[model samples]
Target: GTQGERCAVHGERLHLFCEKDGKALCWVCAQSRKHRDHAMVPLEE
Candidate 1:
């Protein structure tokens, strides 16, 4: 997974996004302001 085994918050699908803070997040989490504006890229997109 990009971020980790699962979402750092939601713990759903493993489409996590790695941030400078060393935390991984999923789609829903990635949509938050914490990661919303952050530069995130999909692996299988």
Candidate 2:
């Protein structure tokens, strides 16, 4: 089956977990500000 969720921006699958803002992130999100070098981990794992 396909991923249950997808990135609204780059049309990517959500596979990261942001420990701060309680949001999810995709590979492109690594370019973001807040979750740049923090606790962003793989949600699929």
Candidate 3:
């Protein structure tokens, strides 16, 4: 885990990591406007 556990809206795992914003997100958000255009990485270990 990066800092927390799962996402609130998506209620899914926070597996997407945005290096640009240095934030943790979910797979759902990764495809949304929130991070769809961001360069992301898989954060789960």
Candidate 4:
């Protein structure tokens, strides 16, 4: 299933996780101010 969880930041599907900040984020959120430099991994992991 490709469906992801809802993200609190963007209200979109969360597909990635920031290892540093420790939060689920959508693609758009990953590119935003908060997670721009944070280490990221796929939520599918």
lDDT of 4 by residue, 1-45 (tens): 656468755566678788888877777776778556648887876
Per-candidate Cα RMSD to the true structure, in Å, reads 4.7, 2.9, 3.3, 4.0
By lDDT, the best candidate is 3
Better of 2 and 4 by TM-score: 2
* Candidate 2 lDDT over residue span 1-45, tens digit each: 664778878876777777775787776786667456576676866
Off by over 4 Å in 2: 1-3
The lDDT values for all models are 0.56, 0.73, 0.75, 0.71
Q: What are the models' TM-scores?
A: 0.46, 0.64, 0.66, 0.59
Which model, 1 or 3, shows the larger lDDT?
3
Model 4 residue 21 CA deviation in Å: 0.6
Better of 2 and 4 by lDDT: 2
lDDT of 2 at 7: 89
- Candidate 4's displacement at residue 18, Å, is 0.5
Q: Any idea how many clashes model 1 has?
A: 0
lDDT of 3 by residue, 1-45 (tens): 666678987666678788888888777777786455647887868
Candidate 3 Cα outliers beyond 4 Å, as residue runs: 1-4
User: So what's the TM-score on candidate 3?
Assistant: 0.66
Q: Residue 35, candidate 4: how far off, in angstroms? A: 2.2
Q: What lDDT is obtained when candidate 1 is compared to the true structure?
A: 0.56
